[PDB]
Symmetry: C3
Subunit: 668 residues, 3 copies
């Protein structure tokens, strides 16, 4: 709908200021976000303040018809503050303090930093509460980036001890809940508990999961401090945060419980590089992967059951990934329309102009170093016009749900049982099989209500609380069916095994138990056939069908030969399928298409690997991350978003096509 | 002969206790080992003790006819003790203290820990000295695991200084023995010597070897403290320890000098993964490598010249190696019979039931999580019956010897001169060539007497003491012949070069000197022909035949072309062959078969790669780690151990076959 | 011209002393360098001194007709000094002190060490000022080796603060020159600046470049202390230093500004191993790469515009590289003649005899361990005779120049924008293309005067000072043409971007601007054709020809398809070509041959990959690093240096051929 850009008047002289806001008006960007790293300029020394620049900045943003979203400067305390109160910095487990010289050099549990966040944010919000045309506020900047969610300092130790006391009540319930008899790891009292440090072997899984939950909850409380004082300033303002893609350390659900709108930063070409399982391909090197960006879009939309923003959007070549080839022609228009299809009503590009200045010189902006426009500006203008023309897009609703569980993520990160195992890649297999049929997908936590969904897929439900278990049993008994992936129903809320066999509380919600599991180097032939041969990847679980009906068996020809691999069971009205195998493309597509068959939804035929389509409101969007070409027959030119006989429409490389009418179709 | 299991009543409720000991009686396991990690349960706080559970435990083990072997709880001091006396923990070279949160968090040289080992072990042995049916005692648990042999704390510094003074007498003998003039590294006094810490370049080889010897001797004295007080408790008891496979940091010979029986922990599928040189193959992924497990069996048997135990045996899937595929059908029966062939009279499986509890949840037991039996239980029962039926097996004696020298191992670990060089792999090449002919092999230190051996193979004798040198000269003059590998006769007892050329004290016990040596990336063609072409690996030493007779020359076609590679010489009665080359399979087999020719022993024809046979007492065992099948004609069905015309016997995948009669044969 | 050896009488008994100096006379080595690591022997305790050995040593070196070059023992302070004043040692960023146990364990900024360098060097030079036959002095030993240029201790912190104050005057000029507004990184005062330590993300580029310049300048001042007191001792003496190959941390130009002769250590087989981009080939494993050793030869010759020495030369197999295969037959004669061709008048081999002693036992010498000669001795004798026969070789002058900029090196090391990017490899591509035509090349800093050069090549001029810019414009306007590589004209003296587009101050000295740049994984097809198809590597810069004339365009067929890749422009008299691409062998050779066409120099036809020729004085040298054979027709046998009809001369594997007459030729 609306577009924007992340501006930094801090770096540029004030002569360029109004001409640049004028260009930002020319492009059609109705939002401008600044003041992230402006603490050092505002307070050069303690007691001295320099607000006026931002005032004029806001003025010009309001002079040209855009509303500016401001942010707390907490991400970068200046050097005088760090030298003044060194206790604010964090420590990694062996105790080395993460110094100044970059961003994110503070600890979420140091009461000192709480005091001075209070001071600085109080003074910056009271300057702007009622009068000016600021739109809302965003918390610090990318909470927990550079692995700053978990600190092992002594302030975190005290916070950990009281968090533990609050969770468990007394020491004996902790010892029996984690079960500390193995390797005589019982705690005599809560003080005897230290944040995990260097030790000869692995750390206790319940201990590590407790510390992960503790770190994420610490940052949730810090964010609530932020949001409390922001709401204190002006009741109309929204509070929001910019999260990151494929980020494991911060539970965005609970922190989003404290805000009004959700935002995140997407850089497709960079994240397709970061050992996205397998070698990043050229078209991926220039456009990214539609499914990684898409799952992040869905996870941040379904946070509040409301549309989201993308607070930072890749403008061109960036600096952090190993290589950064030039993205394809119109890749930014492509990403904007991708986010718009996935639910974003605002897309703000980072940044306005390439910074000549810091350790991000190799990060482009919508403008060059000259003040000349970069490719980002042109594509931003084009997507602006098309966003205007296509309607006041509604909030998508997904018929299918995938349950994303940060606790399962952390617990398996602690115990992968394979070097090539990754929760992100598993959820990606299942979710991308569902999206390869063309549906809109919702990814949610166990907290959400599973009613109102045709089908649900739970690739990893590692820890199953029994309330969650009977909720799913009643959903499958009364409503649609479910597809569970491998490694679900293994541990409890305390990351502990059950006296029963896998999948514990779900064992009767499926037709089988699990004899045992094995982890496989991806060097062995790993196939399944149906009881045609498809291959699976990295993981196998032998199914003991006690209730009923194996579907796929192992043609692996090892010691698991001929044993059930996939299973189905019809408990009452509605079904349940269990996949004890990490499926490759074909098997996952078969499972997805069949579950979609069972739930009367309108899956399109197998869309190509770099082609994704989504129905928002009434219109439907086809985003082409492939650089070849696409041709959809069966649809004549009545499309709203088109580029500059009736044989369909042709969607060029990195192009979008918005069409109305919720299709069941194929293409190229 | 007898079977067992490592039980932990600590984890399980006492209602399952007698039913589980009843099942352990059903399987036929006459030994039960517990109390390893029970310090935290016994002494929850200082002065408070909780013995009674173990009492009843022992009672039930004695109620059902099995003798229980107990162990000191020293491996895991509880948190209250660590917080009480933090000085007990270790430090790695840069000085970071290895905290609590795992096992093995103590230092062998901290007098504090000596005091409290005295306290706890005194109190636990006096509880059981004369009266109950405990069988013997095992020291802590896997001494030095997780790299805990070498600590760099200050207590170790004092222990190192006095160990050095005891070895060298005065500072000047140390300086001249290590020769500290290079890089002006001379010590003015013994206090000027610090345990090795961070330094810009490598560390002195004599210094590092001194510290390795010092760490291992420190743990030998700790073990002698243990054994002294155990023998103090009951004169009948045996003292033993559980060592590890392919473990370089602890000299098991000298610590075994302090005990009565030797035991070790075998997990074949896991250790075949740990960069066992080359990619672990599928049949290896499910059965392991017969030669690695076999050399460990031999090294721990020949420790006391007595049979050994395998205190921990893989029950199924385990947790530590990167991947853990399900082992083959009957792999545990296979490992039990493998150890029985190699000399083990007791084989105790770890553990009884998969622990639901600690950081080893992914480690199976003989029973499932349900209390249901796992594959391990069934295979344990089957091997129990066959162990009963085949006789009261004798102690094997080997005709051939391989000299394993921990000092050579440490010295070459400090100076590999190649990234792909490994003492384990070299000894494996030679030993496996000998075993591929079907013999029983003894692996011993230079301390042992070399008489009573048809032939001897010394792959790496890096440090040759002159007493050892004339012992070998008299052995070769009066008795059998020897085969020396590369890098023998290079340094003295002080890890220092000789003024002479290689191999120093042995130069006249062989026909040649060594012109020079080269290290080779395994990318170049590395062949030898005899003076048909076989390939060698990673190492070459040009031989200068001064006395006599090159056998193999270099067809490598480099600057070493045509120079002697292998050599033979007949000093008196009996011969000596020197292999200045790391031989691949074919060359090593030729050398092994020929040395066996020279010593009138009964080598069988080349057995397949995953097939190993051994003659214990009167019976001989063929263990098949291959999953194909095996067929031995020339032997009709009179076999003792067989699975459930006369064309031989067929040994299926992962099967054993015990036959009587010391064969010279081939197979499949 | 003259040969030598690096002797250590410290290790050997004095009985071998005169026989070894006699052998050194036999070989013809007129220089002997000792006293590097002799501090521990000289001063065993403080106040006690033991000079006499060296006296006799010098005597014998003078008794047999050779002049001995001595060195300060500063590289290895003994243990008593380190224990006495521990503050002398260095610290790496997280603060761990680099202990004793190796060499180079001192800090260049600790005033303590300045005091005791003064003490020890004063006492060692006054012992020898006027009377004896020592030739000159060499500073410590390989300054900064094992990464000891940059220390992060507190003494370095104070030195850094005052160096910064001296460079910038006040804090505000530093903040605006580095531009510290990004991530609020401004400094309130110079004390607020700490040497870079652990921080969650990257460090500021200007900050890191400042610290690199600071470390190198610190060692320049330490070297000036050394040289000042050496010149104080005897006015006739020369001061020199031994630098290293491919060494990035020490600016040899500025330290050479303080000495009279330049020396360096060449080990070709070892450095061709150290991830010299690509797999080191067999002939490289035995001879090295002529271009890496050659560029180091040129960089150390052009330091003072005078000939150089090679203070350490590989004698045979060495210890530091991963593998060390035996070098080819006569490889040392080959290296000696290679250095002689490149300008070395003295070549001193390290070392005399393999040290039996320290952590370098696996490093050969010219003699074996026996005191027997090694291959090095024979080849040293042969190259001695030929050096005598061929004339009193002059100082080479190069017609072409390559600008090597340590600041560009450090700045791109901080921001490679690619994992496979390396300043050494880029300069190697261009320089080796020039040498593959057979010319002599000079590699110099921007400090040197560019007049007197037919053509100049600047592969990376990352930071262009405007004085440098107008110097190059006037050179191209009045004289020859230039070839600029990628990533030149990007930042200023402060490592900051310009408000203009690339290449900033050079934008009108070339026909184009730079649209943008991309980094490429070497997995994509990366070609160019001329406006036949050659391939490029790892880097591309789209050229916007505003002034004139693209030569090569992109046949890569991506989003950069058809855009100019190489460009040429004729500003006045003389031309300029810009290569926005990292060229592979063929493209680089085309560019080199064409620039040589433009400058009327006598390039020979494409010489093979392991063949290098150079014209020193009147004679010209062809060094064959290839092991095949070479045949030069068109030249009959009148050659001066030849090995033991008229169809040319044949140069065998690893042979030299010195011929007179400055050729334009081809070969094999
Ligand atoms: Mg700690
Ligand atoms: Mg230390
Ligand atoms: Mg610091
Ligand atoms: Zn912290
Ligand atoms: Zn210690
Ligand atoms: Zn320092």
């Amino acid at each position: 709908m609306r577009l924007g850009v992340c501006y930094f008047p801090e770096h540029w002289p004030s002569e360029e200021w109004e001409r640049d806001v004028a260009a930002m008006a020319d492009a059609g960007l109705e939002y401008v976000r600044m003041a992230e790293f402006s603490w050092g300029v505002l307070e050069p020394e303690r007691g001295t303040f320099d607000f006026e620049w931002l005032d004029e900045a806001i003025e010009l943003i309001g002079d040209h018809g855009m509303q500016a979203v401001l942010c707390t400067p907490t991400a970068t305390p200046p050097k005088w503050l760090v030298d003044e109160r060194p206790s604010i910095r964090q420590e990694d487990p062996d105790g080395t303090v993460r110094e100044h010289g970059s961003r994110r050099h503070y600890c979420f549990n140091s009461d000192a930093y709480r005091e001075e966040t209070a001071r600085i944010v109080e003074r910056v919000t009271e300057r702007y509460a009622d009068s000016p045309h600021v739109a809302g506020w965003q918390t610090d900047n990318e909470f927990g980036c550079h692995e700053t969610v978990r600190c092992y300092c002594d302030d975190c130790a005290d916070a950990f001890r009281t968090w533990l006391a609050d969770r468990y009540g007394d020491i004996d319930r902790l010892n029996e809940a984690w079960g500390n008899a193995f390797w005589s790891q019982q705690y005599g009292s809560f003080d005897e508990i230290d944040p995990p440090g260097p030790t000869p072997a692995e750390h206790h899984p319940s201990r590590l999961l407790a510390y992960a939950r503790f770190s994420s909850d610490s940052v949730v409380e810090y964010n609530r401090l932020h949001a409390d004082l922001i709401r204190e300033a002006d009741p109309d303002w929204f509070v929001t945060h910019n999260f990151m893609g494929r980020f494991p350390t911060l539970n965005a659900y609970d922190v989003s419980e404290d805000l009004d709108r959700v935002a995140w930063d997407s850089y497709p070409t960079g994240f397709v590089q970061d050992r996205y399982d397998g070698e990043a391909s050229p078209d991926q090197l220039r456009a990214g992967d539609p499914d990684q960006v898409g799952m992040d879009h869905d996870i941040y939309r379904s946070a509040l059951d409301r549309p989201f923003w993308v607070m930072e959007q890749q403008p061109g070549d960036v600096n952090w990934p190993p290589h950064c080839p030039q993205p394809g022609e119109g890749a930014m228009r492509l990403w904007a329309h991708h986010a718009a299809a996935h639910g974003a009503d605002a897309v703000l590009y980072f940044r306005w102009r390439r910074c000549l200045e810091g350790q991000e010189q190799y990060h482009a902006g919508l403008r060059k170093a000259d003040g000349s426009p970069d490719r980002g500006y042109a594509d931003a203008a084009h997507t602006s016009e098309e966003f205007a023309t296509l309607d006041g897009a509604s909030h998508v609703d997904a018929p299918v749900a995938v349950v994303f569980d940060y606790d399962s993520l952390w617990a398996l990160n602690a115990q992968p049982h394979a070097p090539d195992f990754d929760y992100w890649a598993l959820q990606e297999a299942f979710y991308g099989a569902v999206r390869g049929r063309g549906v809109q997908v919702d990814v949610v936590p166990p907290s959400a209500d599973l009613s109102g969904y045709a089908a649900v897929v739970a690739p990893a439900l590692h820890l199953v609380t029994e309330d969650l278990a009977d909720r799913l049993t009643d959903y499958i008994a009364g409503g649609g069916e479910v597809l569970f992936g491998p490694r679900t129903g293994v541990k409890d809320a305390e990351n502990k095994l059950r006296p029963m066999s896998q999948p514990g509380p779900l064992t009767d919600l499926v037709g089988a138990t699990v004899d045992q599991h094995e982890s496989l180097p991806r060097r062995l032939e790993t196939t399944v056939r149906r009881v045609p041969p498809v291959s699976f990847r990295t993981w196998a679980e032998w199914l003991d069908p006690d209730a009923a009906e194996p579907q796929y068996a192992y043609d692996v020809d090892g010691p698991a030969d001929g044993r059930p691999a996939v299973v189905t069971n019809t408990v009452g009205d509605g079904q349940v399928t269990y996949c004890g195998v990490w499926p490759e493309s074909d098997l996952a597509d078969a499972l997805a298409s069949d579950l979609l068959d069972r739930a009367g939804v309108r899956y399109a035929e197998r869309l190509p690997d770099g082609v994704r389509i989504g129905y928002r409101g009434g219109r439907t969007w086809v985003t082409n991350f492939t650089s070849d070409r696409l041709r959809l027959p069966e649809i004549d030119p009545e499309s709203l978003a088109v580029d500059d006989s009736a044989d369909g429409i042709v969607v060029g490389p990195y192009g979008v096509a918005v069409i109305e009418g919720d299709c069941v179709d194929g293409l190229r």
